[PDB]
From Swiss-Prot, chain A:
Domain of life: Eukaryota
UniProt similarity note: Belongs to the nucleoporin interacting component (NIC) family.
Organism annotation: Xenopus laevis (African clawed frog)
Organism ancestry: Eukaryota, Metazoa, Chordata, Craniata, Vertebrata
Part of the intact protein present: 753 to 819 of 820
Subcellular location: Nucleus membrane; Nucleus, Nuclear pore complex
Name of the protein in its database record: Nuclear pore complex protein Nup93
Chain's gene name: nup93
Function as written in the Swiss-Prot or TrEMBL entry: Plays a role in the nuclear pore complex (NPC) assembly and/or maintenance.
Swiss-Prot record, chain C:
Gene name of the encoded protein: nup93
Cell compartments where the protein resides: Nucleus membrane; Nucleus, Nuclear pore complex
Source taxon at top rank: Eukaryota
Function: Plays a role in the nuclear pore complex (NPC) assembly and/or maintenance.
Name of the featured protein: Nuclear pore complex protein Nup93
Originating organism: Xenopus laevis
Family: Belongs to the nucleoporin interacting component (NIC) family.
Length: 49, 681, 41, 42, 133
């Protein structure tokens, strides 16, 4: 999902922000340890916008 | 007791202790009894026991902007000589007076009064600390006091029941103290070690006898502590964790306690699970080990798989898989000629341990985690060193044990288990190929060829390589499977021929290791044998196999029955221990039953293997001299009446009559030999 | 360091308890391999 | 991580609960990217 | 033919004996594998069969390159020292190891058409080169 929305801001470049925010906040509140490299890609792409 | 000069009376008693301490050390290091004895009596002669009173006196209970003055009291703070972080009152007075001298004229008295308030503040903070270091050294004392008082005195001086009652009361009071909400945080680690120590003591004590309310309250305490621990003091964590591991190993009366303890540990519910898991994935190295252990233990002790449920649903197992990738980085490190941290080993161990200790529902989940698949990605195991050898072993060994436990507990059709293991082997084609070409009869390379053959046995069944063509890979894979079965066969000619007489010979130019290695060679045969027993589903090999087998069979019936006599009934005791009065007798009992079962396994093994070689020969001869078009069958029937001499038949029937009637309601051997002779005539 | 002496001791004792569990685990493992072989037989 | 952590904790009228929690999220996320303590606290 | 000698050729390069015989054995096997395991054939071979053939050639060239590490390194003085606890044999073995190197060399030389071993080899090469000259 985040890779897609990322590509969306990519094409728009080459709301999306607030949506990405909702996703990252979800990741945070989620009572389940997602994998590590998962969190890595999430944080990095959330930044790169 | 100086109500007015607390700090002094404290430090006094502290030094007096330390002196008495070095004294007890020496006085034991040579000898003396009556002074130790009198002090003991006054400590315990019933009137509260003395050491109780001693511990019991030590009371474990205890203009300007706010943040600016707080930073000021924080900058002039200094650790007093006994470690207390006291606020330097005089330097604070100096700084406050200076800044006071630095609308301001009428405000001068307000400034000076607020400075005096900050002064009383810094002074109370100092005195507070001073009290803190005082109580700190005080408890350190009473602690080390007990440490010697129980640690070095020959337990003769104390009736055991007294030791139990007192160590108990000590845990009771110390828990009462560490648990009160007003517990100074820093005072935590101290009682920690105390518990650990006191605990193991009571442990041996009660074990040496061999109020359950007390052990229950104890575990309840130590838990409640481990919970009360913040997520920062990973030290106090590892400590409590080890403490619990012991409080468990202390335990049909055994099954009754086991139940009751499982019930207790449950009553904590998901919380302690969440804690232990958190540390397990995240804690400090000492905590990491001790915890992963505790987890393997709790898992072995719990039937309803609940903790397995939590660990799996909570995603922890995935954290573990990551830990596997990381440990792979660690072995990649140790690949170099200078390992930074030997600990990385002990970690990878405790991890794979908790793994192995994880029945069925688990195994479903674990294979579902693709643990194997991760292992398949690992490149380190391909670094078998061309002690270095002892290391590369210590690495490959637990890995192979893992893959084998997998192929075992994963029901025989989770074909991906096989195919992945086969991928593991194919990756190490050169490596395992060499490990097969191994001629050095070292016990190590022995066990390595052992596990390698056991895997290739359970795996290289053709039934897979046809389900993997879903082609060049199918061909290469079946080729590797074939080479595997080829070596798995050819190992029989090494370990199971007259050449074995060479291997036990060249190394003669120790009682347990013998029965061990005998179990070993027997299992090695058994493995190559079952491998072929499936595979068909020079024959002189199989014949000589039955022969040497029956040979060792009488050898073992004899050795084992002699050991049976030995078990039913100084140098003898020394050798009765050198393989593994009262405890050497226990060790002798142990090694006895050990060798006995090892022998009986060798016996059933030869017996099955005999049924096998017999069946394989029966079918092979049927094919060779009944349906094989032609000189081989003539020589065949001839040599068959030639080698299956009535000597062999009589030896086998005597063996069956010897041991089979104690274990097998069927004279299967007699009917098989009859059919064999019938096919021979 | 008399205290430090006690310290070296207790540290060894820890490493001991841990390895002991490691053993008991390996042991039950082999026992399962055995009951396995007997199942196969 | 610690930077954003303080940023969120900071008593200040210019930070509404939303941006606070969104920070604390970005925090835990950068965290999984002693630190174990920081995690336990958070 | 080599693939038919799979276990055999693998052990043959896998020898740890400095028996002059075994030396000549790995020597000629490698001279072959050098003139032989070229990619130019695994292509004209095409199918799972051709995969197997390339794979065998791969194990082959891989070991053949590893052979320089045993025959041209600092380990040389080791495998020559463990044997002293004989002149003609030495002239032989020197010519021989020269050939073994030059062989695996030409192998790579076409292959392009740890580098530290290339370094140490340059070293021993130059030093001998003077001893020779």
């Amino acid at each position: 999902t985040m890779n897609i929305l990322f590509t969306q801001y990519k094409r728009l470049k080459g709301v999306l922000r607030s949506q990405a925010r909702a996703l990252i906040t979800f990741a945070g509140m989620i009572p389940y340890r997602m994998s590590g490299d998962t969190n890595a890609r999430l944080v990095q792409m959330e930044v790169l916008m | 007791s100086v109500e007015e000069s607390e700090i002094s009376a404290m430090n006094q008693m502290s030094w007096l202790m330390k002196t008495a301490t070095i004294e007890l050390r020496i006085t034991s290091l040579n000898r003396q009894r009556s002074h130790t004895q009198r002090l003991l009596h006054l400590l315990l002669d019933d009137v509260r026991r003395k050491i109780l009173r001693i511990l019991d006196s030590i009371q474990f209970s205890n203009f300007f902007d706010r943040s600016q003055i707080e930073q000021v009291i924080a900058n002039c703070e200094h650790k007093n000589r006994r470690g207390q972080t006291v606020c330097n009152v005089k330097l604070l007075h100096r700084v406050l007076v200076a800044e006071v001298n630095a609308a301001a004229i009428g405000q001068r008295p307000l400034l000076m009064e607020e400075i005096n308030t900050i002064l009383q503040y810094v002074v109370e903070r100092n005195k507070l600390l001073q009290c803190l270091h005082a109580k700190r050294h005080a408890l350190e004392s009473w602690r080390q006091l007990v440490e010697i008082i129980l640690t070095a005195c020959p337990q003769d001086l104390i009736p055991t029941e007294h030791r139990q009652l007192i160590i108990r009361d000590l845990l009771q009071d110390l828990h009462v103290k560490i648990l009160d909400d007003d517990a100074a945080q820093e005072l935590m680690p101290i009682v920690a070690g105390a518990v650990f120590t006191l605990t193991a003591h009571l442990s041996q004590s009660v074990r040496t006898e061999l109020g359950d309310s007390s052990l229950h309250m104890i575990l309840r305490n130590l838990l409640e502590f481990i919970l009360k621990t913040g997520g920062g003091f990973q030290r106090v964590r590892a400590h409590l964790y080890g403490s619990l591991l012991y409080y468990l190993q202390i335990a049909d009366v055994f099954s009754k306690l086991q139940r009751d303890n499982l019930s207790i540990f449950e009553s904590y519910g998901t919380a302690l699970m969440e804690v232990v898991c958190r540390d397990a994935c995240d804690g400090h190295d000492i905590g990491r080990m001790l915890a992963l252990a505790l987890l393997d233990r709790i898992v072995s002790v719990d039937r309803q798989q609940q903790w397995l449920l939590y660990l799996s649903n909570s995603g922890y197992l995935k954290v573990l898989v990551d830990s596997l990738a990381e440990d792979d980085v660690v072995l990649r490190n140790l690949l170099t000629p200078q390992p930074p941290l030997l600990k990385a080993l002990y970690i990878y161990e405790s991890k794979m341990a908790f793994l192995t200790r994880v029945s069925s529902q688990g195994a479903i989940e674990l294979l579902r985690s693709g643990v194997i698949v991760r292992l398949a990605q690992c490149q380190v195991y391909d670094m078998r060193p061309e002690a270095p050898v002892e290391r590369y072993r210590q690495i490959l060994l637990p890995a192979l044990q893992i893959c084998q436990l997998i192929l075992t507990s994963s029901t025989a059709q989770h074909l991906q288990a096989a195919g992945q293991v086969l991928q593991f082997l194919v990756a190490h084609s050169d490596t395992i190929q060499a490990i097969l070409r191994s001629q050095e009869g070292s016990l190590g390379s022995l066990q390595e060829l052992a596990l390698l053959t056991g895997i290739i046995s359970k795996a290289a069944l053709p039934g897979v390589l046809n389900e993997l063509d879903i082609d060049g890979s199918m061909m290469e894979l079946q080729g590797h499977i074939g080479r595997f079965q080829r070596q798995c066969l050819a190992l029989l000619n090494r370990f199971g021929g007259s050449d074995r007489l060479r291997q036990l010979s060249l190394q003669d130019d120790g009682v347990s290791k013998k029965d061990d290695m005998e179990l070993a060679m027997q299992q090695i045969c058994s493995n190559v044998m079952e491998y072929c027993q499936a595979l068909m589903i020079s024959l002189g090999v199989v014949i000589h196999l039955l022969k040497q087998s029956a040979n060792n069979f009488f050898t073992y019936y004899d050795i084992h029955r002699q050991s049976v006599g030995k078990l039913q009934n100084p140098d003898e005791i020394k050798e009765l221990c050198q393989s593994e009065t009262t405890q050497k007798y226990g060790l002798a009992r142990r090694r006895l039953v050990k060798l006995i079962n090892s022998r009986a396994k060798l016996l059933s093994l030869c017996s099955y293997i005999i049924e096998t070689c017999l069946y394989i020969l029966w079918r092979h001869l049927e094919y060779y001299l009944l349906h094989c078009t032609t000189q081989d069958v003539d020589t065949l029937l001839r040599e068959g009446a030639n080698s299956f001499g009535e000597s062999l038949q009589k030896r086998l029937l005597d063996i069956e009559s010897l041991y089979c009637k104690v274990r097998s309601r069927h004279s299967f051997i007699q009917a098989l030999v009859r059919r064999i002779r019938g096919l021979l005539r | 360091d008399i205290q430090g002496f006690l310290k070296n001791e207790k540290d060894n004792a820890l490493l001991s308890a841990i390895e002991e569990s490691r053993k008991r685990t390996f042991v039950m493992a082999e026992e399962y391999h055995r009951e396995s072989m007997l199942v196969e037989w | 991580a610690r930077v954003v952590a303080k940023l969120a904790d900071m008593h200040s009228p210019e930070i509404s609960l939303k941006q606070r929690l969104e920070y604390i999220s970005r925090a835990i996320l950068s965290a999984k990217s002693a630190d174990g303590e920081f995690l336990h606290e958070l």
